[PDB]
Design a binder for this molecule. Structure first.
Ligand SMILES: [Zn+2]
Length: 186
């Protein structure tokens, strides 16, 4: 559904809308990767990051948190000229701080997935949208999660960005009622 996919026609973006965005994601490492890539979105089109995903994977150990968490200024120095990623130093540093935060969460709570999913009581919040104009960009839960993640050292993940992540990972289902890609919830 065109309306649901923000009126974007580029089929690389539509692929993301159709096969990733809003589909419940329960795997800890996959959640981390999606969150990390979401943090790179700011001030750019999502298509920009999508086309660079494989480059980010090569830059960041396939977003494996134990490996990313150990990266240093020395790695970031190198990555500032690594081809086909966005060379915004604070964005790149943020991915490392996020990986460190993930490890701290898993130390305290066991599972990064269980930590995040707890914010919606273990099942997707169906926002029951019918029109694209129904959509909000932030809420109280995303704001609290943003704050809570900040306490474990996560960076570049403000309330609006976290809200976007919740929708992307399917913790929130923001697909329109008549979108072919709207997931079934039981
Ligand atoms: Zn949709």
């Amino acid at each position: 559904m065109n309306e649901c996919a923000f009126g974007t026609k580029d089929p690389v973006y539509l692929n993301y809308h159709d096969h990733v965005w809003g589909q419940p994601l329960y795997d800890s490492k996959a959640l981390f990767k999606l969150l990390a890539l979401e943090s790179q979105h700011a001030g750019l089109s999502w298509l920009t990051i999508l086309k660079k995903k494989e480059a980010y994977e090569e830059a960041f150990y396939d977003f494996e948190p134990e490996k990313v968490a150990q990266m240093t200024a020395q790695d970031i120095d190198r990555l500032m000229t690594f081809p086909n990623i966005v060379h915004h130093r604070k964005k790149l540093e943020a991915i490392v701080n996020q990986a460190q935060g993930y490890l701290k969460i898993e130390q305290a709570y066991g599972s990064f997935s269980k930590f995040l999913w707890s914010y919606v009581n273990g099942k997707p919040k169906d926002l029951q949208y019918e029109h694209a104009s129904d959509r909000i960009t932030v809420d109280d839960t995303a704001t609290q999660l943003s704050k809570d993640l900040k306490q474990y050292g996560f960076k570049f993940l403000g309330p609006v960005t976290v809200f976007s992540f919740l929708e992307a990972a399917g913790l929130y289902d923001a697909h329109l009622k008549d979108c072919p890609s709207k997931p079934k919830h039981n």
